[PDB]
Symmetry: D2
Subunit: 125 residues, 4 copies
């Protein structure tokens, strides 16, 4: 099994009240659903990603990332977000991320295609 397979798998919540539901595979896979509390979004969207299944053993975090494309049966926001970050285990486990949200644009508006921000996920709230 991945070192943090058990710690990462489950339901996570960020500071916006979004819900991240993920399964970590032994092989480094991340698979699940994302529900945003904000933006041009409703209900759940597919996600996929990857994590380091054999991290450093020195109080270092575990590197991971995932993608959501904002198309489901209800809406299409013609956009994708990627989260890149690290999982930190323990009584107050956290996933600390930075993200990039790209919208499809014309070539003329491509300079303004990409938002950046940061989300912190916890197992409570």
């Amino acid at each position: 099994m991945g070192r943090d397979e058990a710690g990462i798998t489950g339901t996570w919540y960020n500071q916006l009240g979004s819900t991240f539901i993920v399964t970590a595979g032994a092989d480094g896979a991340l698979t699940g659903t994302y529900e945003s509390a904000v933006g041009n979004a409703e209900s759940r969207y597919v996600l996929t990603g990857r994590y380091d299944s054999a991290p450093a053993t020195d109080g270092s975090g575990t590197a991971l990332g995932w993608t959501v494309a904002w198309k489901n049966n209800y809406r299409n926001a013609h956009s994708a977000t990627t989260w890149s970050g690290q999982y930190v285990g323990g009584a107050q486990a956290r996933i600390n991320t930075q993200w990039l949200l790209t919208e499809g644009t014309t070539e003329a508006n491509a300079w303004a295609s990409t938002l950046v921000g940061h989300d912190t996920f916890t197992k409570v709230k």
Copy 2:
């Protein structure tokens, strides 16, 4: 089939000489392998991601993203990169991305965990 399923699927090369091999599914999935020409990397790494399978029809690009965790049978760089960007079709097709590379760190060094940059992928070179 996804609108750009045929256009995205295949082999892509970036400005560093890295090789991105991807299959786009009808359902929005991206699955393949990445080989970096730079950094703490050798040979191929698994990737997964998502794309907008029903983009805007107005000369807009197609939003997508993917993740690589830098662990394979040869090396573990305890890090993950996410690319967020858009596919632009046509005779000079391109995937224009920005990326976030997070390394696992101690809590003390977490301020310095994440590199940002930009890659442009073409079907030639």
Copy 3:
């Protein structure tokens, strides 16, 4: 006077324990000193930047940014950080930022030149 000239001018502290000392001019100027609690840094460094001296009047924040080059009489880290963010006034005033830290590199290592992160500044602590 700038709308938030009085609110921005003074001493601010971030989550790392760094100290940001700034004077806001009527004309949109920011001038002061920065002392980092982390990294290849000691004592104070010059900063300069700009802010919106006539912001929206609808509970919107006030856009601003500033730069530090990490050279002073004690050390040279051959690097610069820019903070881009917004000032939010009131009893719990905050400056919410994202930053980009670029180091001088060779052309070969330029893909790895730039860190990204986020700092929140308060008037206490």
Copy 4:
């Protein structure tokens, strides 16, 4: 004089056709004007920033950054951009940057306040 004071001072142009006019001081200062070819902008805006006046002497670039707040006598876009990057000297001199553009927002829309991108400046075109 700063090592690259002479190389940085002057008129630069990016891939969008924007014009960056800067004076580098011996002391690490950057002062000038910016004119954007895109966005909610017209004519010139004040900029200020900083550069490493004593860079590494090994074919390394010179770290720098600057800020524009998008208020002038003609328009106010309630936003600021910071560019963070490095100057590379020689026959094809370049300033390679990444930027963060923050708009003033309500607290509810603050997750969507900040665009990220990349500009390359040359002395021609």
